[PDB]
Symmetry: C2
Subunit: 513 residues, 2 copies
């Protein structure tokens, strides 16, 4: 019934439900108004905490951690411009379907839009870029209002984790004094399914047709193998994006095509490889010549599998929009599509151009923006993570990273793209996948340079490769963040750097000028 108890009961009810609904990590930024929420989250036994004093960096850190783990991740910042720094990562989380619980501390009603210090309008702060907005009540501790606090904690995580996944924003007006009572201590998975009538139409329509699988960047785990099996069963090629995982799932394969970016630039190859059906999985692939090829082809059956109804199709090519779970579709197609449907000449044609274009690529790579990918492909461990920057590193990983027999989790921010926040993204992802590697340009590296503090203060393992095409001497940046600096001037100098980097748990930075 006293002010500080009221504040403690209210927040504890909320925070307890977040953890009980699956939040294990919180990414906190400090400030006056965020203090009571930060202190009480710290007191929670199960809940782990990371402190990032740059809110922009905190947002991308949370993003990367939630993208890699499929876990809902809390953000917490104070009132004022701090909340606005979450915006780039929230917009990214929106488009890449990443479950961020963004909690913004705020002034109380008597201090809202009144000219108070550290205070701005935080109602619908991120606009359409969140799944849900809640302006929470001022702290109360009645039976009704405590259950309300629990209810909103459960709803936040549920909405964020329900497909299509995405960011959820909760605004907390907090009235002074913000001193909580810490002594004594205050402390169902659904998927989309197609109908039996609806699967029969699809099965019959492409039962003996020349089809192509197109897989772009995809979220879901262990979808590599059953996809490979189906394409093998049908005799269909898979045009696999580097971010699909099919180019690095730990096995060599007879259906995965990886040189399509090269050979679809040529006009006669465009004509000869013309399919009857196309089935898309995941986002759109990064390849512009593939994009232009899929745009050009008409009078085909263009399926896209989109369980979240996000309507990602910048080509407007869709004929049949499929709103179901990817693993479900692959399994029913593995059970119901015939075995005797195999045309050997169809797959053969695709694999032939693929073998030919591999030679054209490998004839040049014994001489450096393409050779850096090729050297990285060989030097990487059998189980590793690779975050790729959105500039030139993503176009060169499409050309010079063919299929390898190592398990490599490849991650990029492919929603709203952008050169911002990719260091913190990689660093958040490094909590899940080890060892973590970052192929990055100099512009992106500078942009999110101060996110390297998280690697220093939490003793994280990340190997950074900077393609500096370009006035900046990055040795001083390395020394500042306690990083081991390496300058690779040759192919052999890169080999020594990678070997040294995997040898110690810590931050490594390899600059290639």
């Amino acid at each position: 019934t006293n002010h500080e108890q009221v504040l403690t009961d209210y927040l504890a009810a909320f925070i307890e439900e977040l953890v009980q609904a699956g939040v294990k990590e919180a990414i906190i930024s400090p400030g006056s108004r965020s203090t009571p929420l930060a202190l009480m989250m710290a007191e929670h036994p199960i809940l782990k905490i990371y402190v990032d004093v740059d809110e922009r960096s905190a947002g991308f850190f949370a993003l990367g951690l939630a993208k890699a783990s499929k876990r809902p991740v809390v953000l917490l910042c104070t009132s004022g411009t701090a909340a606005a720094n979450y915006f780039p990562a929230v917009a990214e989380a929106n488009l890449s379907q990443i479950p961020l619980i963004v909690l913004t501390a705020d002034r109380p009603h008597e201090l809202r839009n009144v000219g108070a210090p550290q205070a701005m309008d935080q109602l619908h702060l991120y606009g359409s870029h969140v799944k849900d907005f809640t302006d929470m009540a001022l702290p109360e501790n009645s039976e009704e209002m405590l259950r309300y606090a629990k209810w909103h904690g459960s709803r936040a995580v549920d909405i964020a984790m329900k497909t299509p996944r995405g960011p959820v924003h909760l605004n907390f007006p907090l009235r002074e004094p913000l001193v909580p009572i810490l002594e004594p201590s205050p402390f169902y998975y659904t998927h989309e399914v197609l109908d039996d009538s609806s699967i029969q139409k699809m099965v019959t329509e492409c039962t003996g047709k020349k089809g192509v699988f197109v897989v772009g960047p995809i979220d879901k785990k262990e979808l590599e193998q059953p996809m490979v099996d189906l394409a093998k069963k049908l005799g269909w090629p898979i045009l696999a994006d580097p971010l699909s995982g099919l180019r690095s799932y730990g096995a060599l394969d007879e259906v995965v095509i990886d040189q399509y970016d090269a050979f679809l630039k040529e006009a006669e190859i465009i004509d000869k490889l013309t399919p009857e059906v196309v089935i898309r999985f995941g986002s759109m692939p990064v390849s512009k010549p593939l994009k232009n090829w899929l745009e050009q082809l008409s009078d085909i059956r263009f399926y896209v599998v989109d369980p979240g109804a996000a309507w990602k199709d910048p080509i407007k090519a869709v004929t049949d929009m499929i709103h179901c779970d990817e693993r479900f579709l692959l399994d029913i197609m593995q059970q119901n599509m015939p075995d005797d449907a195999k045309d050997a000449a169809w797959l053969n044609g695709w694999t032939s151009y693929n073998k030919v274009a591999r030679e054209i690529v490998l004839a040049e790579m014994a001489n450096e923006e393409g050779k850096i990918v090729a050297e990285l492909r060989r030097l990487l461990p059998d189980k590793a993570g690779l975050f790729i920057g959105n500039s030139m590193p993503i176009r060169d990983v499409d050309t010079y990273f063919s299929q390898i027999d190592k398990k490599i989790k490849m991650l990029a921010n492919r929603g709203a793209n952008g050169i911002d926040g990719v260091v913190s993204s990689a660093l958040g992802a490094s909590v899940v996948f080890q060892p973590m590697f970052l192929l990055i340009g100099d512009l992106s590296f500078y942009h999110d340079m101060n996110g390297l503090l998280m690697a220093k203060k939490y003793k994280m393992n990340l190997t950074i490769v900077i393609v500096n095409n370009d006035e900046l001497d990055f040795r001083f940046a390395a020394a500042f963040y306690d990083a081991d600096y390496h300058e690779a001037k040759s192919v052999d100098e890169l080999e020594e750097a990678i070997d040294k980097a995997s040898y110690h748990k810590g931050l490594d930075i390899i600059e290639v000028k």
Copy 2:
């Protein structure tokens, strides 16, 4: 009539009107979609350009430049998360009434919300935090549409510069190819006034009353002297904020009170200094004991002068809201208020506590977070600029920076406050006021560390004083950005650092641990 000419005619009409309406500077961030707008702004003869690759830093740079010069300043970035990085500075510009023309490049309609790379929803991106939003047409070059492009260029700057001043957002959908034709080359002030009936009511109501002037952070230039004259004429004290300019306008004074933060904490002094009227100018002062004092007093006449109708009053103390120009009000009060109204005992009481509290402060400052302000007060030139960070440096400049007889422009981000972007803010302001000094905490310095690139690549003069109260060794940061590093361990070590800093045109950084 051809695509690239259309694009050139459209943008040139817009850009020409911006310059013709008073835009002299543009702050550009690079990218694919921003390229045609950036190239053509570069071709404009009068328009000066600054390139900031961090969009967050660019926003605060523009903010600082526009705050210092009262000039409208263009921002330009590419599509995607780049636009979202402008948000903290836009929210700040909104509350601090700063005229930013924010231009965001965008995908065309066929690539909007369709799953395209580097693309997000940019309609009403900043929400209520801008004065105006325009989604511009796709480039056309007809007589109607070219005048439309001119019209929007004039409207943008006008709305941004009309009081209450603020940010204006224009979104530009641009269709590929984005290659402009650069060869050959494509290239009233109103103020609020009170009525004669309305001034007579105010003049008579405080014609012989014990009144107090309260001046917080204020925009308007040369408002120092006529304010001083009126308070001298009336025998009224001025409780001047450090950011009012009255504490450093180049003259010592017999009405400016600067120790109110100290002596209004005491209960009997609160009671004895009780006025009959209060007149506020500018924003709310940073002093919490002054805030609490003005809150506590009742049955008074509380005037606030607010020409922009922003209603800045977190105390809700207003009795008479005055919507007119500050210079106008001071001049008519200088002409119409009587001379024989002077009560000597009223001003005497205020100046007495002020003299007493100065002794209490100066008795301690011969021994370091307060002594750093006091040393800075003495060591500064006769004509200088000082940007202050929003953390502990603003509370200590209120206590330990009494009135000096030097002209010092003092600047802070006092709208939405926040520890973010104050380096770029100071660096933008450094274009106008020279020499520029920055008193800053370590948290703020880290937050906007990468804004120091602007000091390096444009060879700017800024002296940074870091109050490191606190793992980071800032020498490596200094070496990275070509800055002269100084470590001040004593009072005399600070003197040597300041002397060296003012001696060369370039970036200086003084750390006090």
